[PDB]
Amino acid sequence: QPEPDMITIFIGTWNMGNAPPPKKITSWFLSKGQGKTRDDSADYIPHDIYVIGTQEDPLSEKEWLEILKHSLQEITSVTFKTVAIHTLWNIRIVVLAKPEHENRISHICTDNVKTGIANTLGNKGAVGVSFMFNGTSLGFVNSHLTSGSEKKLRRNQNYMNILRFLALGDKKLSPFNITHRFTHLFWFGDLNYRVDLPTWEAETIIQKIKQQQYADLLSHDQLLTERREQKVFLHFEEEEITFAPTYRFERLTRDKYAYTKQKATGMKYNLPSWCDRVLWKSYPLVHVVCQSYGSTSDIMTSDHSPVFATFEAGVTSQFVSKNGPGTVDSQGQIEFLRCYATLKTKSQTKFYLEFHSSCLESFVKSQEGENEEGSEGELVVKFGETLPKLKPIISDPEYLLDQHILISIKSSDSDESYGEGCIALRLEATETQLPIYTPLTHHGELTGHFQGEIKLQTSQ
Numbered sequence: 001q002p003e004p005d006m007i008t009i010f011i012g013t014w015n016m017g018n019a020p021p022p023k024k025i026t027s028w029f030l031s032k033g034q035g036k037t038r039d040d041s042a043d044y045i046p047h048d049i050y051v052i053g054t055q056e057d058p059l060s061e062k063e064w065l066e067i068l069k070h071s072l073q074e075i076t077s078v079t080f081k082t083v084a085i086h087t088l089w090n091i092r093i094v095v096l097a098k099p100e101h102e103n104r105i106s107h108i109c110t111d112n113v114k115t116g117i118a119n120t121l122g123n124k125g126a127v128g129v130s131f132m133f134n135g136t137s138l139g140f141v142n143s144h145l146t147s148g149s150e151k152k153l154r155r156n157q158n159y160m161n162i163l164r165f166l167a168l169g170d171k172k173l174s175p176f177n178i179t180h181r182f183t184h185l186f187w188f189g190d191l192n193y194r195v196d197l198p199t200w201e202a203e204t205i206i207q208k209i210k211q212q213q214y215a216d217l218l219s220h221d222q223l224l225t226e227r228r229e230q231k232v233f234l235h236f237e238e239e240e241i242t243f244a245p246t247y248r249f250e251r252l253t254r255d256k257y258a259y260t261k262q263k264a265t266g267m268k269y270n271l272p273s274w275c276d277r278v279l280w281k282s283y284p285l286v287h288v289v290c291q292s293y294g295s296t297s298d299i300m301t302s303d304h305s306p307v308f309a310t311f312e313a314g315v316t317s318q319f320v321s322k323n324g325p326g327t328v329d330s331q332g333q334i335e336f337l338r339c340y341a342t343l344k345t346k347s348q349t350k351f352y353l354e355f356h357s358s359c360l361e362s363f364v365k366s367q368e369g370e371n372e373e374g375s376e377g378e379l380v381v382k383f384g385e386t387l388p389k390l391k392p393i394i395s396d397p398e399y400l401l402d403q404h405i406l407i408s409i410k411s412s413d414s415d416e417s418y419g420e421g422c423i424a425l426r427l428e429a430t431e432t433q434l435p436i437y438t439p440l441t442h443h444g445e446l447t448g449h450f451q452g453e454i455k456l457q458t459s460q
């Protein structure tokens with residue numbers, strides 16, 4: 001029975017509006033409704049992994065597991081195994097997998113982050129799950145961010161708190177937050193970004209939605225504008241939105257947007273918005289293709305419509321050679337030549353690099369680089385040809401060309417990371433000096449760049 005080199009992943013996000021679901025929710029798991037939908041011919045084909053994020057979920061974990069498992073069994077005739085479930089208040093994540101994957105899955109982690117302080121601590125935050133699927137690390141974040149059209153900055157703050165403090169994945173990757181720990185990271189939920197148009201335009205917006213003309217609304221979507229200005233979700237992807245705004249509907253129909261201010265809304269307008277979103281970030285040159293992104297039309301118990309996204313995702317096998325794991329393979333080496341870090345920092349410490357990768361027995365610390373002044377004010381840290389030669393556990397190019405090296409640049413004075421990035425080993429050539437590049441981030445914000453050349457030796 002061969003190990004897969006691809007799997008499909010279903011991501012669901014649904015703000016349930018503290019109401020039980022209707023008896024049938026299969027349209028959600030089938031990616032049927034509005035937007036980029038799944039072909040009817042695929043309906044019986046199970047996804048490998050289903051990840052369900054809910055917000056304002058009134059159900060017990062047991063109640064929801066029973067509905068989800070029975071839904072998937074009805075669709076697929078497959079009884080799914082529960083990988084993980086984690087709830088913070090009314091924010092929940094469920095991970096289900098086909099039974100054939102039970103022994104491919106390991107290192108399961110769950111965590112949550114509560115956002116805000118005093119007033120603003122009590123119902124918003126995020127839950128997450130990570131695990132290994134054979135040689136591939138998968139991370140999943142369901143976040144319910146701050147509501148309200150005039151709080152996009154708070155939402156951006158909530159995002160940074162979640163990515164700093166959510167403790168998922170390999171704890172040995174100590175300089176790296178969740179935006180660097182996974183082959184594939186899926187971040188979804190009620191992110192609560194709004195269409196930023198005047199309140200007086202509510203009926204105009206509704207008109208536009210009825211005509212399925214979203215262009216003039218998407219050009220005011222706060223998540224798209226904030227992402228374009230690098231204020232939030234830097235280096236994440238989102239599929240094009242081709243479905244109607246998923247909020248705020250009158251319950252028990254989809255015919256009406258309920259946008260007017262009410263005591264129940266704290267006298268706030270809720271203009272139709274794409275509150276409910278799925279984004280991802282995968283390591284460079286790893287296969288990931290969005291195959292659906294849309295909303296259901298027939299699940300009407302909430303003032304939100306469910307959102308689905310599906311993905312093809314490249315995975316690798318758990319590789320064993322004569323040598324590694326448990327030793328190095330002297331026929332492999334990774335050389336970093338003529339490298340330099342360009343940092344935005346104004347500080348004047350020396351810096352060193354750490355190289356982290358599952359292709360190494362353990363992380364490698366470099367010598368300190370040489371600081372120079374860049375022409376436009378910047379710090380340039382030169383490493384020359386001084387960088388340690390990295391000794392991979394396995395030299396087989398079928399393994400090594402699929403790997404990645406995480407890089408942290410750290411202050412010698414404080415040992416704190418000033419920037420984190422990732423370099424793919426999926427090179428055009430071996431035994432050949434080739435350009436490499438990564439942006440560097442810290443707390444998910446751009447702090448600089450790392451570039452130079454690499455020379456990869458494999459056994460072939």
Ligand SMILES: COc1ccc(Br)cc1CNC(C)=O
Pocket residue numbers: 081082083084097101102103105106107108
């Ligand atoms: C090692 O642990 C697991 C491996 C595979 C699957 Br599938 C699920 C688990 C644990 N999850 C639960 C609910 O026991």
